[PDB]
Amino acid sequence: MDKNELVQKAKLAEQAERYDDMAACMKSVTEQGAELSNEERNLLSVAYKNVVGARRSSWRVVSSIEQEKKQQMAREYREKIETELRDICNDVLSLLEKFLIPNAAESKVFYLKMKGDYYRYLAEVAAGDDKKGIVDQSQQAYQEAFEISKIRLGLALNFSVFYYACSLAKTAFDEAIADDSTLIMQLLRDNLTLW
């Protein structure tokens, strides 16, 4: 198999914008012997965010566009992406639970964030009774990270938004007041700026 080449590959894919080839190059790597070099730990985080993002972005536009015959055409299109989307979270969400979270320091909150992230993603998507279980599933996953942090920064944000709430925001924000970190914060403020 040779991990240190499938990494060089995962890198080389991003060095050329192909995010699926990338996200994939990492899957092979995560599904090797876990505990990922903070760099490796990174590539996967992003590759995957792009990929599911791409689809997440698109899901957004069409759901609205939809809202007659032309619309069954939309749902049929939504349906199709909701699918690759699901395929991506589920794909990664798994890796996490069956490889990533169990093989960790700081990472443990990182992953736990991400884990709750992806169900959040799936949560946006769900419909029938499935939804409730996915939502709760994310929370416990997120809530678990909120407490373990006590990066952590980024987390506070995402958990924060996940609620829409603000209450949790100002709190984890306010305390922080005491370049990278900066950025994130701006956003949470900005979030309240919104709410």
């Binding site: 992003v46 980024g154 995402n158 950025l183 919104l194 709410w195």
Partner: peptide, 7 residues
């Protein structure tokens, strides 16, 4: 609305 991160 809102979110979320970057890389």
């Amino acid at each position: 609305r809102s979110t979320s991160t970057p890389n």
